[PDB]
């Protein structure tokens, strides 16, 4: 019952995109944005940069190819992606014991009353039980989790001091501490977006365009309209 | 029994809006408000800005389109939205085992006494049990959770110093610390509003106007009347 | 049932590569990269350096053999690799008791009704039960976990101070603390990549080319295109 | 069933070598290495030093017998070694109760139907049960764990200050704190390697050459090729 | 079954010696060692000092009787020794209930079918059950644990400052703090060695020579060869 | 069964003496020791001082009666002693229920078949059960725990500053803090010795000479021979 | 069975006296002691002061009635005393249910076979069960716990500064902090003695002389002989 | 059985008085005491002040009515008093279910064999069961707990500084901190006394004189005799 | 049984008043008190101020209406009051299941033997069971908890500094810190009184006069008599 229940509940693709924290931007009249999209995950998001540019341009901004003449920077990295089956947390039922029991009972029942003979009701029941167990194992609640790191840069008139601190671990004994200081006129803020795609026997190709569309809109909505 | 019990209990739309903390504002005679509404969530709240303006104007304030000549700022961001089924926390009953048992017993019972024959009471019972299990899976206690970040700005005669501190994580080794200082005559306060919409098989389109109305009134009620 | 369920679920090779943290790099026009790939693990990844160079060159960079004339350094070390069987966490079922019970019942059942005689149904059942238990033990959900440490170096105009701190443990009594200070014009950042390969009775030779391909792309994608 | 299941699963020698942490070394053109290998454990690793020298020489380095004219030092100590039986964590089954039950049932069964007589089926069953329990106790999942401490020294142009701090515990009352300071031109880093050897009824002599080979390669791979 | 299972598993003497931490010594050309071995435990280790001297001399060092002309000091104290029975952690089975049940069943069984009479099968069964319970109690998994504190002294050219801090507890109210400072040219490091000897009904006299041999080699192996 | 099992296992006196921590003493040519032995416990250890003097003199030292002309001080206090029954941690079995059940069954069994009559088998069984319960209560695993505080003083050339800090609790409100400072040429170190004596129905008089002998040797072994 | 088991085990008075911590006193030739014994507990210890004086005088000291000409002070306070029944921690068995069951069964059994009649076996059984329950309630494992605070004063040549700190709690709002400083030539140390007296149905009058004798010896043994 | 067991065990009044901490007073020749006794509890302790004066005068002190000419102050406050039933922690048995079961069985048993008729055995049993349940509820293990705060003042020659610190909580926002400093020649110490009175169906009037007597003696015993 | 057991146990009104902490007041000859009683709770305590004045006047003090000429201030606020049913913590028994079972059994029993007929014993039993369940629900162990904050002010000659610190929370972002300093000659102390009133089906009107009387006496008893 668990296999078909999962199939009915998760019959439709469900995509959820959740931004971790709110980045507040001062009102301004500038409309130049520079984009820098990376993907260090093992899954394809090649269409993300184009969709972000379209969403940003639809809000009244102009996308420039050189970062020096851009008032805003949108830096995004699709950091990691994970795949898991939600049925695996239900216990031993996900293994296929329930599917085997239903198949075995159906095979013996359909043979025990119709042409019972002797031994035939065991061979058919075993074959049906094996098929039932196999069919249970082929149904999984596939869930795709994606993590995207977003960095937004805004130009400012105030002097901004950037202190780079890095504790480069060297072994089990210690680390190499690197320090430097630079000044500029740019404020940088970071935020994280978590994406989820869920469907029965979901293939990432089907969920890829929807994940890109929702992720692009969420990142582009940090900027104010016009 | 769980499916119909959920349907009866959650037959009506229930919307709850809860502000996290109270923002205290000094009494004043100014009535100029600037609005800035964002939506980084994956759900539509396009009518929120208009409803906030109507609620603010109904309290005696004047909405201005330029932030420089506004005594008050209302900055709101619909940060994230989540959907979950409350029946999923009830255990294995939500899977559909209870629905299958009721359907199987009804199918066998209606056939065991009326035209029992042989084998017929099993085929009808299995079909009825499958339908009963399927009907249980199609009933869910849909709950929508929404998080909205609110920032309120108030002009003041005192000098306000803003120190921007950002620890931009760079990897597993360290971070880039950004610091800057600016002065102004504006006080900013933050608060959070949590919204909930609950109904059986709820679609967000039905709950969207109610969520917007309650959220707009809650945010606009931070300001005093007149 | 657990043995064949594992075989069906894990019938295909699944490789997952996940970068731990995002390294942000400033936009630049330099395209010289120096590579330094190490492997202190007990498994072969000899093709990793060549695949990283191909992926880096495909993005518009030029690989140089001398570190002094390289704007970027990519230092990677395949630190450790582990092998485990996921079925071992299922309990006593992984031992082979379930396989023995199925084999014993099948052996006695196929003999109890056909040529029952006396004592024969026990010898066949014991032999079939032993074979069933043996076949269960030969099926394992092999999972390979690999840890890779990545260090990225970027040239900068700012003066960078490196303080080496090492607490070399000397016994149970204390340690020898080593300190030194050097200056340079290079920023170094660290990150970690976790790789997983899963299949039934998986041999590392089959998963080696896929692990190298995914790891090379993930590391090379830290750099921006062109 | 546990005894033969362990024998089948652990029928082949499995050796795992895992370095705890990554030691990063700056690129250089020096190729002189000094070796210093110790063994304070109770197990023989006499061939480790020779295998490290061969692996180091195969990577293009020259091994020198005097530490003063060596750019690199490789100091390794096989600190401790432990032996344990993995079956001991399975519970009372490892004691031999399961083996006794199988032997007792087989002895009584083979006698209860063939020449039952009286009392004979108890003497044979008891003898077979004792043999079955004894055979279970002679099968163990032997696992050898080895800990190796590694210290790597690299010459540098920077001045290195070494502060020796030792809190020599004197009783339950206090300690004798020893402090000293020396300067030099050598950086030292520490790391740890954990080795595991697993097989049914494993003897350390069989696993000794494999442990030495994997440990030597792991330590020598800290150095870059050529 | 537990008694004979323990006898078979622990039929051979097993001695394990594990050094807690690694003491690193700089390479040097000195070969003078001074020994100072103490034993505050309740067990005899009179042969430890002689075996340490033999192991040290076999590595190329010269043992001197006066500490002032020794480059190295080896100070060892056999601090404490403990004896425990590993069967005591198995529960009530170690008491002898299992042995009584086997003896009682054997006594009644051997009499119930052969010369049953009346009352005789109870007297023999009770006597056999008592003997079986007694034999179970005489079998124990004897484990000897030994703790040895090791202090190694090395001459150095640097000035070494020793600060003696002792918080001598005086009652429940406070303590007497003693402080002093001395200077010297000797570095001292501490480490701990844990020894284990396990056998069925083990007597410490049998395990004494093996414990001394392994402990002496472990301590002497802190020094480099030649 | 628990009563006789305890009697067999603990039939012999077992004395364990364990020093808590190691006190390290510098090599020296002095051989004058002053003894000061106290006993604040409730048990007799009158022979401890004489045995310590004999053990110290057997190692080449000379015992002096005046502390001013002694290079070493040995101050020991037998602080506390405790007595407990190890069978009390076994549960309700130590109460005597098991002994009553065995006695009641034996009384009824020996009467139920031989001269059964009526009512006689109950009076004899009750009397035998009461005796069996009483005999169980008279068997206890007596364990004696003793704590001894040891303070060792050594003359030194360095100036030793003793700061006496005492927080004399005055009530629930506060305390009276006492502070003083003195200088001297004597180092004091503290350690603790834990003694255990275990036997069935053990009387402290039997274990007293063995406890004194082991305690005296352990304390005297802090000093080096000759 | 619990009632008589407790009576047999605790048939003899057992008194345990345990000093919490060791007070170390420097060797000296003075023999003047001043005593000050208090008793704030609810139990009589009137003979404690006399027994302490006798024990102190037996060790060679002279007791003086004026504190100004005494080198040593012994200040003791019997702080508190508690009484508890150890059977109360055994559960519901201590209530008397076990005693009622034994009495009820004995009453019905002695009447069911001898002059059974009708109804008589219930009246006798109820009366015997009530008596059995009552007798169980009259047996208790009485344990007396006593806490004694000890303060020892020793004259010294060093200047001793006493800082009195008292945080006198004034309500739920705060406290009144009292501070003062005095100088003197006397060192004070504190320790605690815990006394236990255990017997079945123990009356404190029987345990009073033994508690006084053990407490007096323990306190007087802080001083060295002669 | 629980009701009568409680009645037998707690048939006599038991009063326990325990002082929390020891207040140490320097020996002196002054004998003037000023008393100040308060009672903020809800129970009557009107006789406490008179009994303290009698106990103090019996020890050789003189009670004065004006605090300025008193060397000692005894300030006591009976802070709070609580009443609880110890049977309430036994579970549902204290409710009266056990009493109802005994009464119901007795009523049915006395009627089932004597004049059974029909229905009569139910009416009598119900009435007897109700009476039995009612009688169980009227028996309670009444325990009275009393807390007394004691403050003792002693004149001194040293200057005493009293710093009054009070954090008067003002709301959920903050507090009003009050600070002041005064000097005097009086030391104040605080301690707490806990009193317990236990009996079946105890009325506080019966326990009042005993509580006063024990409390008065405990407080007066802080002072030394004469 | 739970309903009537609660009715019998709680048949009488029980009022408990407990002061949290003791406020110590210096002896003085002043007798002017100013009262200020507030009640922010939802329950009526209108008679509290009059009863406090009567209790204060009965102790020899004079109540003044102007705070400036009062040596003592008594400020009290009845902060909050809560009502709860103690039967609600007993579990499902408080719901009324036990009452329904008793009523159903009584209804069926009184009809099953007298005029059994058919179906009549079910209608009467259901009606009686419903009445029994209803009667159980109408019985509750009503407990009223009241919290009273007390502030006592005392005039003093010392200068008292009051620092007002208030952290007025402004939102989720921060707070507004208010600070001020004033000087005066008045000490203020705070304490808390907890009041409890318990009875079956208790109405607050019945417990109001008793709560006022006990609360007034407790607060007035902080002051010394005369």
Author numbering:
A (entry chain H), B (entry chain I), C (entry chain G), D (entry chain F), E (entry chain E), F (entry chain D), ...: 22 to 247
Please quote the authors directly.
In incompatibility group F (IncF) plasmids surface exclusion is mediated by the outer membrane protein TraT. TraT is an outer membrane (OM) lipoprotein that is exposed at the cell surface. TraS blocks DNA transfer following mating pair formation (“entry exclusion”) whilst TraT acts at an earlier stage to inhibit mating pair formation (“surface exclusion”). TraT is a hollow homodecamer shaped like a chef’s hat.
Overproduced, affinity-tagged TraT was solubilised using the detergent dodecylmaltoside (DDM) and purified. Cryo-electron microscopy (cryo-EM) of the TraT preparation revealed homogeneous ~100 Å wide particles from which we were able to solve a 2 Å resolution structure of the TraT complex. The overall structure resembles a chef’s hat in shape but with an internal cavity extending along the entire long axis. The bottom of the ‘hat’ inserts into the OM bilayer as judged from the position of the detergent micelle and from the local surface hydrophobicity. The TraT monomer comprises three distinct elements: a globular core domain, two transmembrane α-helices (TMHs), and a long β-hairpin. The globular core domain is composed of two α-helices packed against a predominantly antiparallel five-stranded β-sheet from which the TMHs and the β-hairpin extend. The membrane-spanning portion of each TraT subunit extends from the core domain and consists of two TMHs connected by a short, periplasmic loop of four amino acids (S136-A139). Notably, the TMHs from neighboring TraT subunits do not pack tightly against each other, rendering them relatively mobile and poorly resolved. The hairpin structures of adjacent TraT protomers associate into a continuous β-sheet that forms a ring around the interior face of the open end of the TraT cavity. In the native cellular environment, the transmembrane end of the TraT cavity is almost certainly sealed by a lipid plug and so does not form an open channel across the OM. However, the structural data show that TraT is actually an integral OM protein in which a large globular domain associates with the membrane bilayer through a pair of TMHs in each subunit.
